[PDB]
Design a protein around this ligand. Structure first.
Ligand SMILES: CCCCCCCC/C=C\CCCCCCCC(=O)O[C@H](COC(=O)CCCCCCC/C=C/CCCCCCCC)COP(=O)(O)OCCN
Lengths: 71, 59
């Protein structure tokens, strides 16, 4: 009557199983990274130049006010 | 049949040397590990709520 029934793989087998290493490269050359670093350094230098010159002028103005008030 | 696990030779041209130096001086693989841990942070944990939840068993 009944037939044999046990754990067997399905007909046609199972699908392929990935086993190879997969470590993809994110991707950016060293030249590009160094250029980005130097560029942001230069931008910071320029902004600091302008801001510190303005600060020098402001300090000179304050010193002038003190000089006027001194006598 | 046998495989070689650590039998690679780095290329000595200027571009590859610059890439290795950039990795050394900017810590690229360290940020890669940081990013993988960050990605792992944003997924569901595997913790069940014992004793209100139970692990699977068999007959
Ligand atoms: C044109 C004019 C420009 C003016 C000059 C500017 C030049 C700039 C270009 C070069 C500067 C880069 C230097 C920055 C620091 C470099 C230090 C370094 O590279 O040390 C590494 C090592 O550094 C480390 O490994 C430290 C890692 C510590 C583990 C924690 C990882 C930290 C990374 C997470 C993010 C860090 C966040 C930093 C910014 C935070 C700001 C709040 C070298 O060691 P080894 O690879 O083992 O080899 C030495 C033997 N030959």
């Amino acid at each position: 009557a009944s037939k044999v029934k046990q754990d067997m793989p399905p007909p046609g087998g199972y699908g392929p199983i990935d086993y190879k290493r997969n470590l993809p490269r994110r991707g950016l050359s060293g030249y590009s990274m160094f250029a980005v670093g130097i560029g942001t350094l230069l931008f910071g230098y320029w902004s600091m130049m302008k801001w510190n010159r303005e600060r020098r002028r402001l300090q000179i103005e304050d010193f002038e006010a003190r000089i006027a008030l001194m006598p | 049949t046998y495989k070689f696990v650590n039998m690679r030779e780095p290329s000595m041209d200027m571009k590859s040397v610059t890439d290795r130096a950039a990795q050394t001086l900017l810590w690229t693989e360290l940020v890669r590990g940081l990013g993988m841990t960050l990605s792992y942070l944003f997924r569901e944990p595997a913790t069940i709520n014992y004793p209100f939840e139970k692990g699977p068993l068999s007959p």
